[PDB]
Amino acid sequence: GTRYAGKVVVVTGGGRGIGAGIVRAFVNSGARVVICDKDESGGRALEQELPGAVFILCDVTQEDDVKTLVSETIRRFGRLDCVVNNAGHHPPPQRPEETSAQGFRQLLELNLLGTYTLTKLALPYLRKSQGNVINISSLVGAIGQAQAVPYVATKGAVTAMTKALALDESPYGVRVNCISPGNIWTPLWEELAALMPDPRATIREGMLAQPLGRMGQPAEVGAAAVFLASEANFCTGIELLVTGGAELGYGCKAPDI
Amino acid sequence: GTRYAGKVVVVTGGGRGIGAGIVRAFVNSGARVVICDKDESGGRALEQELPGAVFILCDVTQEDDVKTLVSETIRRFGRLDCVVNNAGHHPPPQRPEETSAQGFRQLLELNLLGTYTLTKLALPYLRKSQGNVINISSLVGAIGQAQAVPYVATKGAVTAMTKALALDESPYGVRVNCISPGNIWTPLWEELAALMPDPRATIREGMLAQPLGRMGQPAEVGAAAVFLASEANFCTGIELLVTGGAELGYGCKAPDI
Amino acid sequence: GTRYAGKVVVVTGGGRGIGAGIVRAFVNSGARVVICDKDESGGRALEQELPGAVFILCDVTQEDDVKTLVSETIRRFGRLDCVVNNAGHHPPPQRPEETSAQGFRQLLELNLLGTYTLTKLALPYLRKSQGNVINISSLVGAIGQAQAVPYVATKGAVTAMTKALALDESPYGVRVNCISPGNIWTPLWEELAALMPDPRATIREGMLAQPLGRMGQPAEVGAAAVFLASEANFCTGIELLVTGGAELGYGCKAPDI
Amino acid sequence: GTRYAGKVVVVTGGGRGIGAGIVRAFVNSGARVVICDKDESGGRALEQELPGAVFILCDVTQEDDVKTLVSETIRRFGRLDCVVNNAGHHPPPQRPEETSAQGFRQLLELNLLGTYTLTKLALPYLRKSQGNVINISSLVGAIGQAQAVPYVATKGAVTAMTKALALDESPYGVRVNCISPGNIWTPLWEELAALMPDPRATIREGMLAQPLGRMGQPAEVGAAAVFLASEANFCTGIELLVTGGAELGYGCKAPDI
Ligand SMILES: NC(=O)c1ccc[n+]([C@@H]2O[C@H](COP(=O)([O-])OP(=O)(O)OC[C@H]3O[C@@H](n4cnc5c(N)ncnc54)[C@H](O)[C@@H]3O)[C@@H](O)[C@H]2O)c1
Ligand SMILES: NC(=O)c1ccc[n+]([C@@H]2O[C@H](COP(=O)([O-])OP(=O)(O)OC[C@H]3O[C@@H](n4cnc5c(N)ncnc54)[C@H](O)[C@@H]3O)[C@@H](O)[C@H]2O)c1
Ligand SMILES: NC(=O)c1ccc[n+]([C@@H]2O[C@H](COP(=O)([O-])OP(=O)(O)OC[C@H]3O[C@@H](n4cnc5c(N)ncnc54)[C@H](O)[C@@H]3O)[C@@H](O)[C@H]2O)c1
Ligand SMILES: NC(=O)c1ccc[n+]([C@@H]2O[C@H](COP(=O)([O-])OP(=O)(O)OC[C@H]3O[C@@H](n4cnc5c(N)ncnc54)[C@H](O)[C@@H]3O)[C@@H](O)[C@H]2O)c1
Ligand SMILES: N#Cc1ccc2ccc(C(=O)c3ccc(F)c(O)c3)nc2c1
Ligand SMILES: N#Cc1ccc2ccc(C(=O)c3ccc(F)c(O)c3)nc2c1
Ligand SMILES: N#Cc1ccc2ccc(C(=O)c3ccc(F)c(O)c3)nc2c1
Ligand SMILES: N#Cc1ccc2ccc(C(=O)c3ccc(F)c(O)c3)nc2c1
Ligand SMILES: OC[C@H]1O[C@@H](O)[C@H](O)[C@@H](O)[C@@H]1O
Ligand SMILES: OC[C@H]1O[C@@H](O)[C@H](O)[C@@H](O)[C@@H]1O
Ligand SMILES: OC[C@H]1O[C@@H](O)[C@H](O)[C@@H](O)[C@@H]1O
Ligand SMILES: OC[C@H]1O[C@@H](O)[C@H](O)[C@@H](O)[C@@H]1O
Ligand code: NA
Ligand code: NA
Ligand code: NA
Ligand code: NA
């Protein structure tokens, strides 16, 4: 309850799923948390539920929303120590020829540029606090995924951008790290599975993609984020995998001709 | 002179630098090459110089330019076997707070979406020929670079997109690979060094970043591309490093406090 | 003080350096710790200093020493939850032609087989407790190091072995992870620097190999180990980098000929 | 037929499987090849079959066999340009508790120390010729494999050792690279499958582990080796994957509890 006491954290997309788990983990560590989300429903309830968390409506694709997010965080709490860029989206499965440049641009706006924009506006305050940035990327940025060319590209960009910024901000004492989750059971996962011909089979396949035989939880991503913020002072530019071992070994991906 | 005989290759940004080296390597392997560039000067001269190479003016950020590139390749040569997405740019060094979202969007248009667009328009023909895609990414997509947040992000995206598309196109027999060059001596490298306070010192530093003690040549990237196209039939989704060992070992990147 | 309460941890090479930092981190988390070392001096003093830590003399290259370590841990504390395979050595810098097969075999005995042996003897008890294995590998297993062929090979083996065992033990609920430290200021680092022509310059170079501009501390490796043991329940087979960013960007490792 | 003309290559374990494919690829490139194997049957026939290849009986675990291999290569051909350390073995599947330290030591002797020993004895001649080293590692050194702790550890060591030696030999102009094959259809693969309850199902699973839906061929590893030797002059310390994409995407490796 004291690992991150006295600290102020902003979590984007904090109203449900992984983001809500991260919010909860930081509140439990003693921090004050600003929940950012484009939708009011989940985050407003989370603000009522958690002493030490407040909700600010903010679409991270809208630069003036993000400017107000940062200025309101400072006005209300007087410092900023950690930014968790969690807001993002995975479209339904799309064959490459079914994608469009414009859809790709829109997904880049959320998954990549929204992270870039908040980080930029927050860095002056993070320098004052020797704070840190945590980006929520994805395992599939590293290893690929089927029927997800735009999504995979955005997460490859987030992971690489994390390393670049880590280099640039290291002289100023600001660490920049990312978490690459694998299959985490969230409302996004449940929504995507419901789109498939056999949602139960899709979910079972999702569980069995991990050697641990289950999907991960938001709380587990949250514990990884609290570690990076509060106890990883010699870590910068790392990609912390929270995947249950999905990247390990051979599996079903499809004699020598 | 016969490793890729009878094959048709498109090389974007083929008018100078790495792209020209790739053009030359494919012509020497027996292929017919379409040189795509937004600038006429280098590519037009290369077309006169090399029997088996022709030049098509095409800005890969303009979808109708790229549509015409593909349709003219098929009209003139009757097949398409390999697309080398080499066109790209590295801006001058920029501190993160000196970057802009709009500049980031523009660099994404060239380095990422231009590759995406040509690949998309070319894939129907590559499926017919069991052809392949070669994307020119960068080592710094994997390991980061200082004062280059947007550039690094675009190349992280290219490398990840390569793996995603490799997965999607594997059922159709189309391989998708990338090359990640390190410091290659090109007109871009020379132009960027000339911007620095001490260009000669910047170049010397660039050479010494490699254990091999020199920068690479376009011809060396070209040989890697010809290998991927012509002789790497069990390789898909790989990142072939052409870096002189820059990613190896400890160096100068800046007792326990 | 309660994150790992009620748990029993064995730390090999726990008498000084990183191992002692790991011991301290686990005691501070509420665990009981068995300090294993081949030398009595540091570990015996640590046992007197820390309530909740005890010292067992044990050379991890001697299978009967390790058998007794495990049986005495169970006899004295009634369970085993985590094994931290930290014992290891870095020889003085050695040109490849100055190495020998026999010296390589001896270093494999310590850095690789000692880890293998304790893990094997401990796994039956870790299965009962749904415990976990933490191996201390090295960044240079991943990226290489100059004048250290045998050492680098042993750490490449530890990192790979971690992933293999993670796969094998995942059905039994036992997680297997590693930490790859970079330059950590320890008595080993101080001893090796003292061998060099200019020890102060060697140390300064060591600090500047990290973007953060300093070396790491044992306490920082220790916090990473406590995270892996106590809060990383969806992590198995990962390599957690504790390197200060040394693997990021271009540096000094040595125009195109 | 001229890419590696006038060059002399040693291939260990060259009598069958991948090694024989590598032998054939180098002969077809114009090189003279010394086939090293501990068994006479395959390599002696290959020597009769291929003008430009000769067979030398040599067990790479026996240092005096390897000394004679190098001295006989120089005596008979007057130079040495490339060493391909292909000899190695994969034991039958073994649960971790079914392995032994002594079995692990023996596998290290072949898969790791045999490579080390030939490389050491060959490096003085490779320096004279600005030659290169190609080690045959494995994809599972990078990503792990089930029921293969010792094997995986040996290949993690080979890949890491490749990078270390690349660093050490770069000042002398000697490049050191590795190839990490995935599932390649060889007599070893056929022998291991025959041990399983349902060999045909094991083989079908092996094919489907690759997005390309087949296993690789020795000839494909061979083409990768010829590229590294003859045309990859700016590549050192790389791991060239010849895996058919097995490392890409999610598969079958085994809702959030
Ligand atoms: N669930 C997984 O398996 C998984 C795996 C890897 C990575 N991820 C990443 O984790 C993050 C969270 O994923 P999730 O599964 O919890 O998703 P989710 O859809 O359950 O929750 C995402 C939250 O972000 C909010 N959000 C979306 N667009 C926003 C915007 N423009 N501005 C502000 N908030 C916005 C949503 O309203 C929602 O509350 C994303 O970056 C996703 O790419 C998820
Ligand atoms: N030079 C290096 O050290 C280096 C290192 C890693 C990666 N790369 C990558 O290699 C590729 C080539 O780099 P280079 O150094 O040869 O650069 P360069 O600037 O010397 O040549 C690039 C060529 O692409 C053309 N081009 C630019 N924008 C274009 C567009 N919109 N449409 C069509 N053609 C366009 C240019 O006119 C030029 O002919 C780029 O993707 C770059 O990111 C270069
Ligand atoms: N210090 C660094 O920069 C660094 C970097 C990366 C990895 N590592 C790894 O971290 C680990 C600890 O390194 P360190 O710097 O603290 O070293 P250290 O030499 O300071 O401490 C090592 C401890 O292990 C003990 N030990 C050695 N051989 C043993 C054996 N046979 N049985 C039992 N105990 C034995 C020693 O007595 C000593 O107490 C090693 O695995 C090392 O390879 C260290
Ligand atoms: N087949 C695969 O799927 C695969 C995958 C990844 C890596 N590999 C690696 O490729 C290499 C070749 O594998 P393969 O499948 O062709 O095996 P193989 O068993 O078919 O052929 C290996 C050859 O090496 C020889 N050899 C074995 N021990 C030797 C020794 N002590 N001295 C000299 N020669 C010796 C054998 O006699 C045989 O001719 C090995 O290093 C293996 O680990 C194979
Ligand atoms: N085809 C398909 C499919 C079906 C259901 C899914 C459910 C969830 C996800 C998803 O959002 C996801 C899954 C894994 C990731 F690493 C990641 O970043 C995102 N992907 C799915 C992909
Ligand atoms: N600061 C700086 C700086 C100075 C000169 C440079 C000259 C060239 C490059 C460059 O374009 C480059 C360098 C290395 C790369 F891997 C890459 O993709 C691009 N980067 C430079 C970066
Ligand atoms: N040459 C050299 C040199 C000089 C001093 C050193 C001091 C410490 C170390 C060392 O033990 C080390 C350094 C970094 C590592 F990642 C690692 O696993 C071990 N390596 C050194 C290497
Ligand atoms: N269980 C099991 C199993 C069954 C049949 C196999 C047949 C071949 C191999 C094998 O030798 C191998 C397979 C893949 C590799 F990357 C590698 O280095 C080696 N592994 C197998 C593993
Ligand atoms: O909808 C799937 C899951 O989403 C998670 O974010 C919630 O914490 C769970 O209660 C829910 O089961
Ligand atoms: O301008 C730097 C270099 O660019 C390369 O692309 C050209 O092939 C070289 O002739 C030139 O030295
Ligand atoms: O000897 C170098 C360092 O070793 C560390 O393990 C100790 O905790 C420090 O007190 C000491 O400065
Ligand atoms: O035994 C499996 C395969 O081994 C390969 O090395 C041979 O070239 C093939 O002819 C054979 O089918
Ligand atoms: Na509240
Ligand atoms: Na022409
Ligand atoms: Na005590
Ligand atoms: Na012959």
**By alpha-carbon position, which residue is closest to atom 5 of ligand 9?**
A186
Indicate which residues of C carry an active-site annotation.
Answer: 151
Using DSSP, state whether A85 is helix, strand or coil: strand
Helices assigned H by DSSP within D78-186 = 101-108, 114-129, 140-143, 149-169
Please tell me if residue A142 touches chain B, with a CB cutoff of 8 Å.
yes
DSSP state of D186: S
**By alpha-carbon position, which residue is closest to atom 6 of ligand 11?**
C17
Task: Confirm if A209 and D255 have CB atoms less than 8 A apart.
Answer: no
Helices assigned H by DSSP within chain A = 17-28, 40-49, 63-77, 101-108, 114-129, 140-143, 149-169, 187-194, 199-208, 218-230
Does an H or E element contain B158, and which?
helix B149-169
Domain count across chain A: 1
Please tell me if residue D164 touches chain C, with a CB cutoff of 8 Å.
yes
Q: Which positions in chain A touch D251 (Cβ < 8 Å)? A: 209, 250-253
D160: closest CA of chain C, how far (Å): 5
B103: closest CA of chain D, how far (Å): 32
Task: Confirm if A16 and A90 have CB atoms less than 8 A apart.
Answer: no
Q: Backbone phi, then psi, for A200, in 5-degree steps?
A: -65, -40
For helices D218-230 and D17-28, give the axis angle rounded to 10 degrees: 50
- What are the DSSP E strand ranges found in D25-141? 32-37, 53-57, 82-85, 132-136
Task: Confirm if D3 and B230 have CB atoms less than 8 A apart.
Answer: no
Whole-angstrom distance, CA of residue B32 vs CA of residue C88: 57
DSSP state of C111: I
Interior CA angle at C102 toward C99 and C105, to 5°? 100
Whole-angstrom distance, CA of residue A141 vs CA of residue A162: 13
Chains with 3 or more CB pairs closer than 8 angstroms to C? A, B, D
Whole-angstrom distance, CA of residue C170 vs CA of residue B157: 32
Does an H or E element contain D242, and which?
strand D239-242
D38: closest CA of chain A, how far (Å): 26
> Which technique was the structure solved with, according to the deposited record?
X-ray
Interior CA angle at A92 toward A86 and A97, to 5°? 120
User: Dihedral angle at the C-alpha atoms of B229, B232, B235, B238, nearest 10 degrees?
Assistant: -60
Task: Confirm if D164 and C154 have CB atoms less than 8 A apart.
Answer: no
Q: Which residues form the pocket of ligand 1, taking CB atoms under 6 Å from any ligand atom?
A: A 12-13, 15-19, 36-39, 42, 59-61, 86-90, 110, 114, 136, 138, 181, 183-184, 186-189
Q: Which positions in chain B touch D247 (Cβ < 8 Å)? A: 237
Task: Confirm if B24 and B49 have CB atoms less than 8 A apart.
Answer: no
Q: Are strands B53-57 and A175-181 parallel, antiparallel or unpaired?
A: unpaired
Q: CB-based burial of residue B136 (10 Å sphere; 0-12 exposed, 13-18 middle, 19+ buried)? A: buried
The answer to whether the CB atoms of B254 and C216 lie below 8 A apart is no
Task: Count Cβ neighbours within 10 Å for each residue of C95-115 and write b for 16 or more, e otherwise.
Answer: ebeebeeeebbebbbbbbbbb
Q: CB-based burial of residue A52 (10 Å sphere; 0-12 exposed, 13-18 middle, 19+ buried)? A: middle
For helices A149-169 and B149-169, give the axis angle rounded to 10 degrees: 150
Provide Rg for chain D, Cα atoms.
18
Whole-angstrom distance, CA of residue B124 vs CA of residue B196: 45
Between the CA of C144 and the centroid of ligand 7 the distance, in Å, is 11
Q: Residue A29: which CATH number?
A: 3.40.50.720
| Helices vs. strands in chain A: H and E counts, helices first | 10, 7
Q: CB-based burial of residue B77 (10 Å sphere; 0-12 exposed, 13-18 middle, 19+ buried)? A: middle
Q: Which positions in chain C touch A223 (Cβ < 8 Å)? A: 227, 231-232
Q: Backbone phi, then psi, for A142, in 5-degree steps?
A: -85, -40
For helices B40-49 and B17-28, give the axis angle rounded to 10 degrees: 20
D27 is in an annotated binding site: no
Cβ-nearest to D211 among A205, A213, A253: A253
Among C100, B220, B252, smallest CA distance to D113 is for: C100
Q: Backbone phi, then psi, for C170, in 5-degree steps?
A: -60, -35
D188 is in an annotated binding site: yes
Q: CB-based burial of residue A200 (10 Å sphere; 0-12 exposed, 13-18 middle, 19+ buried)? A: exposed
Please tell me if residue D141 touches chain B, with a CB cutoff of 8 Å.
no
Between the CA of D17 and the centroid of ligand 4 the distance, in Å, is 7
Q: Tally C-beta pairs within 8 A across B and C.
A: 104
Q: Backbone phi, then psi, for D102, in 5-degree steps?
A: -70, -40
Whole-angstrom distance, CA of residue B18 vs CA of residue B94: 23
List the single best residue of B192, B250, B252 to mutate versus C (max C Cβ within 10 A). Answer: B250
Whole-angstrom distance, CA of residue D201 vs CA of residue D196: 9
Q: Are strands B53-57 and C82-85 parallel, antiparallel or unpaired?
A: unpaired
Chains with 3 or more CB pairs closer than 8 angstroms to A? B, C, D
The answer for residues whose C-beta is within 8 angstroms of residue C138's C-beta and 6 or more apart is C151, C152, C155, C158, C180, C181, C182
Whole-angstrom distance, CA of residue B34 vs CA of residue B54: 5
Interior CA angle at C41 toward C40 and C43, to 5°? 70
Q: Which two tokens stand for residue A196?
A: 């498939």
Beta bridge partners of D34: D10, D54
Closest-CA residue of D relative to A143 is D248
Closest-CA residue of A relative to C234 is A244
Query: How many angstroms is the resolution?
Result: 1.6
The answer for residues whose C-beta is within 8 angstroms of residue B209's C-beta and 6 or more apart is B182, B183, B246, B251, C250, C251, C252, C253, C254
Domain of D99, in residue numbers: 1-257
Whole-angstrom distance, CA of residue C136 vs CA of residue D215: 35
